Design a protein around this ligand. Structure first.
Ligand SMILES: CC(C)(CO)[C@@H](O)C(=O)[O-]
Length: 303
């Protein structure tokens, strides 16, 4: 078999881990064992950002990483993590799998990646150790961890938080109180036990977060066309499979976290959240042509 190295930053039972496993399985099956996927996971290889550099270098062939982390590599990706772009998965799926998302995946070539598909991370929700949050006013001052992504730092600056970008993991900082909160989908909060270091959760659903499933461009294009097709086929089916797997578990995660004692605000002030993020579309980042046109194309597609 040819071994193919695929990295994720998270652990077994996590969303991108499950997608990768399913991919590795399907690939082994469909390729009659001509390929064998070697998953690297947890913190072996550093942050998602370190991972990307390794994939860009070719020392790792494939990875599944949170899409926001790619905007350092390809600015237009930031538009995907614009707040309240998507408010349901039906719309998200159609738009991401359709020509607009596909064109954004294609333009990852500019940074030396082949973009294969989007997979699901989830709606991100806000958590903290300081007070309940209903409105943007409630986040004033809070030291909220954000991913190493330009759009996310500016987003949370715009809402009046004091955001700090930082690679995964983050639990020690939260427990040591050095950071007041963070934000992520429900599976993350549960599977990484963030409830242990975070009293509060608000269901803001502020960003619909995807993973990007990608490969080193040069390595991928040097494969025969039938194998390039074979790999895309497997990753597309893996991503579709994992969306369903994860979405089946969301409900249970919420209840798990409730049972665990988190104080949950289930309907925070979303209209006031939306208004407060309005100036972000004139951010330094979002003034850039490529980025703004990508945002516009995405929004148009939702309608
Ligand atoms: C937790 C995570 C690595 C899951 O992809 C990402 O959402 C993050 O860093 O917040």
């Amino acid at each position: 078999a040819e071994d193919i190295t695929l990295a994720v930053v998270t652990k077994p039972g996590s969303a991108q881990y499950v997608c990768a496993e399913r991919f590795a399985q399907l690939l082994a099956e469909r390729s009659d064992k001509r390929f064998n996927v070697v998953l690297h996971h947890s913190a072996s290889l550093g942050t998602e950002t370190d991972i990307l550099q390794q994939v860009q270098l070719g020392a790792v062939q494939m990875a599944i990483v949170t899409t926001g982390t790619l905007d350092a590599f390809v600015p237009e990706m930031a538009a995907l993590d614009f707040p309240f772009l998507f408010t349901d998965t039906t719309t998200a799926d159609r738009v991401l799998d359709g020509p607009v998302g596909r064109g954004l995946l294609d333009r990852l070539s500019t940074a030396g990646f082949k973009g294969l598909h989007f997979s699901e991370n989830g709606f991100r929700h806000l958590t903290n150790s300081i007070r309940p949050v209903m409105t943007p006013d409630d986040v004033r001052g809070l030291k909220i961890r954000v991913m190493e992504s330009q759009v996310h730092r500016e987003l949370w600056r715009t809402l009046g938080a004091n955001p700090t970008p930082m690679g995964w993991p983050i639990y020690a900082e939260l427990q040591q109180g050095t950071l007041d909160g963070q934000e992520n989908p429900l599976w993350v909060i549960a599977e990484y036990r963030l409830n242990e270091v975070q009293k509060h959760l608000s269901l803001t659903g502020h960003v619909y977060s995807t993973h990007t499933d990608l490969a080193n461009l040069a390595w991928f294009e040097a494969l025969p066309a039938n194998d390039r097709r074979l790999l895309a086929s497997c990753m597309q089916d893996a991503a579709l499979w994992q969306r369903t797997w994860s979405r089946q578990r969301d409900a249970a995660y919420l209840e798990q976290l409730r049972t665990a004692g988190m104080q949950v605000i289930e309907r925070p002030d979303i209209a006031t959240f939306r208004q407060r993020v309005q100036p972000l579309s004139g951010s330094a980042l979002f003034e850039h042509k490529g980025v703004r046109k990508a945002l516009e194309d995405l929004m148009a597609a939702t309608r």
